[PDB]
Amino acid sequence: GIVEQCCTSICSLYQLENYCN
Amino acid sequence: GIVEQCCTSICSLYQLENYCN
Amino acid sequence: GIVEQCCTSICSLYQLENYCN
Amino acid sequence: GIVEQCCTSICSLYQLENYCN
Amino acid sequence: GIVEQCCTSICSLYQLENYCN
Amino acid sequence: GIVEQCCTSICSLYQLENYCN
Amino acid sequence: NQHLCGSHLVEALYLVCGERGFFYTPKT
Amino acid sequence: NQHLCGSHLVEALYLVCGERGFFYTPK
Amino acid sequence: NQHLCGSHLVEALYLVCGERGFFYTPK
Amino acid sequence: NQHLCGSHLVEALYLVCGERGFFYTPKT
Amino acid sequence: NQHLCGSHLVEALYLVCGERGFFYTPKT
Amino acid sequence: NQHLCGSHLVEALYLVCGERGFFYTPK
Ligand SMILES: COC(=O)c1ccc(O)cc1
Ligand SMILES: COC(=O)c1ccc(O)cc1
Ligand SMILES: COC(=O)c1ccc(O)cc1
Ligand SMILES: [Zn+2]
Ligand SMILES: [Zn+2]
Ligand SMILES: [Zn+2]
Ligand SMILES: [Zn+2]
Ligand SMILES: [Zn+2]
Ligand SMILES: [Zn+2]
Ligand SMILES: [Zn+2]
Ligand SMILES: [Zn+2]
């Protein structure tokens, strides 16, 4: 879940890439 | 310049990283 | 008040229409 | 396509509702 | 009009202050 | 520090001018 | 449907109202 | 290419006005 | 001059969809 | 690297993915 | 006059400074 | 129609830089 990675926790720009198509 | 470059043509986030302190 | 409807509480897009001119 | 349609011409929020999960 | 003026030509935040309640 | 002036505390638009080049 | 405050609320009003325009009166 | 159009206008109004509030009406 | 382009499109999608979520794919 | 929620998270995804597109699925 | 953090603070600086440019140094 | 202009540029800078901070100066 992107929310638990990056909203509820802190995440990187490469972690955000996981959710690109 | 980057500000003009990003608006006039293509810009990558990698190129924008040069302007971080 | 829009704030008490939609900021302090949760509101819908039709509730936001109430504040259009 | 919707992304091109919204930018090239008119888009309603109703039309954008098709792209919700 | 201010909305058209800001988009068509130059706008200062001072000019936008006229539209505060 | 702009953060302690305007994020952690409340600041004015003339206080924001202090951080223009 | 949505929790919206400050500038996000205003952008939401712009989207929903559009040409109709709107009034943002947070105090009353 | 220009400046305060559409969404950006109402964001600038919120900044300038804030708790005072504001009216937005195009022509 | 127009309306929902790039960044503004995905902001409008979040508003309309919200907790439902959404997919974004240009052509 | 960054705390991002709601519309800010989505704008971040748009910037990083761009042409690739993305999916925002907050519930799962 | 306003409580501003993160990306909103930066957008505010852009609006007020504009052509003058600005520096965002949150740590000091 | 293009990409990172004006307001969107400084938002992308904040994302990329964050707590590091950044300088913004057009030509
Ligand atoms: C998600 O679509 C709507 O329900 C909607 C409601 C009010 C509008 O003005 C536009 C769309
Ligand atoms: C700050 O630059 C990056 O590390 C970066 C990471 C992922 C991208 O997609 C682009 C840039
Ligand atoms: C609301 O108008 C102002 O007071 C203002 C202050 C600083 C500026 O740079 C511009 C406008
Ligand atoms: Zn903006
Ligand atoms: Zn924009
Ligand atoms: Zn914004
Ligand atoms: Zn927007
Ligand atoms: Zn926005
Ligand atoms: Zn925000
Ligand atoms: Zn943006
Ligand atoms: Zn934004």
Tab-separated table of C-alpha atoms in Angstrom, chain A residues 2-3, chain D residues 16-21, chain G residues 1-2, chain I residues 10 12-24, chain J residues 6 9-10 13 22-28:
chain	number	residue	atom	x	y	z
A	2	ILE	CA	1.348	3.390	-1.097
A	3	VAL	CA	-0.382	5.123	1.843
D	16	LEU	CA	-13.481	11.942	-14.929
D	17	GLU	CA	-15.505	9.720	-12.568
D	18	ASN	CA	-15.078	6.860	-15.089
D	19	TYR	CA	-11.406	6.569	-14.055
D	20	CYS	CA	-12.065	5.920	-10.351
D	21	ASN	CA	-11.441	2.381	-9.054
G	1	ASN	CA	-17.076	12.439	0.265
G	2	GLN	CA	-14.034	14.637	1.154
I	10	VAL	CA	-4.549	14.232	-11.336
I	12	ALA	CA	-9.222	16.681	-10.148
I	13	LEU	CA	-9.118	12.862	-10.205
I	14	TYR	CA	-8.200	12.739	-6.507
I	15	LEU	CA	-11.093	15.097	-5.695
I	16	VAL	CA	-13.638	13.138	-7.750
I	17	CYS	CA	-12.416	9.666	-6.696
I	18	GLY	CA	-10.676	10.108	-3.322
I	19	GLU	CA	-10.588	6.948	-1.192
I	20	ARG	CA	-11.888	4.917	-4.158
I	21	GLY	CA	-8.601	5.628	-5.924
I	22	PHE	CA	-7.976	6.015	-9.650
I	23	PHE	CA	-5.824	5.036	-12.637
I	24	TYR	CA	-3.932	7.599	-14.740
J	6	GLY	CA	-3.713	12.853	-0.466
J	9	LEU	CA	1.128	12.134	-2.998
J	10	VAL	CA	-0.755	11.989	-6.327
J	13	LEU	CA	3.344	10.149	-8.516
J	22	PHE	CA	0.192	5.389	-12.455
J	23	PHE	CA	-2.396	3.852	-10.154
J	24	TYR	CA	-3.487	5.426	-6.871
J	25	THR	CA	-5.013	2.695	-4.685
J	26	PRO	CA	-5.068	4.021	-1.102
J	27	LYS	CA	-7.281	1.312	0.453
J	28	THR	CA	-5.154	-1.803	-0.229
